[PDB]
Amino acid sequence: REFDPDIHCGVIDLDTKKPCTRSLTCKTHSLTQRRAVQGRRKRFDVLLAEHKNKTREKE
Ligand SMILES: [Zn+2]
């Protein structure tokens, strides 16, 4: 709804054409694409680590 750079993927999604507020483990975008975007207040990986601490479910 409200793109949250602190929490979300940040990467302007070519589907939706808005930042990527899918999730922190955004299925739309590859790892590099999440990392490339400086959306979060921390690195992507470090941020995803927090995601994994919550939603530690990865495919
Ligand atoms: Zn994304």
From Swiss-Prot:
Site positions per UniProt: Cleavage? 6-7
Describe the processing and modification events after translation: Proteolytically cleaved by caspase-7 (CASP7). The cleavage may be involved in SCA7 degeneration: the isoform fragments may exert distinct toxic influences that could contribute to selective neurodegeneration. Sumoylation decreases the aggregation propensity and cellular toxicity of forms with an expanded poly-Gln region but has no effect on subcellular location or interaction with components of the STAGA complex.
Query: What are the TM regions of this chain, as residue ranges?
Result: none
Q: What are the residue boundaries of the SCA7 domain, all occurrences included? A: 1-59
User: Where is there biased composition of kind Basic and acidic residues?
Assistant: 51-59
Endpoints of the signal sequence: none
Q: Tell me which family the UniProt entry assigns to this protein.
A: Belongs to the ataxin-7 family.
Instruction: Describe the protein's quaternary organization and the partners it interacts with.
Output: Component of the SAGA transcription coactivator-HAT complex, at least composed of SUPT3H, GCN5L2, TAF5L, TAF6L, SUPT7L, TADA3L, TAD1L, TAF10, TAF12, TRRAP, TAF9 and ATXN7. The STAGA core complex is associated with a subcomplex required for histone deubiquitination composed of ATXN7L3, ENY2 and USP22. Interacts with SORBS1, PSMC1 and CRX. Interacts with TRRAP, GCN5L2 and TAF10. Interacts with alpha tubulin.
Associated clinical condition: Spinocerebellar ataxia 7: Spinocerebellar ataxia is a clinically and genetically heterogeneous group of cerebellar disorders. Patients show progressive incoordination of gait and often poor coordination of hands, speech and eye movements, due to degeneration of the cerebellum with variable involvement of the brainstem and spinal cord. SCA7 belongs to the autosomal dominant cerebellar ataxias type II (ADCA II) which are characterized by cerebellar ataxia with retinal degeneration and pigmentary macular dystrophy.
Q: What biological function has been recorded for the protein in this entry?
A: Acts as a component of the SAGA (aka STAGA) transcription coactivator-HAT complex. Mediates the interaction of SAGA complex with the CRX and is involved in CRX-dependent gene activation. Probably involved in tethering the deubiquitination module within the SAGA complex. Necessary for microtubule cytoskeleton stabilization. Involved in neurodegeneration.
Name this protein carries in UniProt: Ataxin-7
Q: What species was this sequence derived from?
A: Homo sapiens (Human)
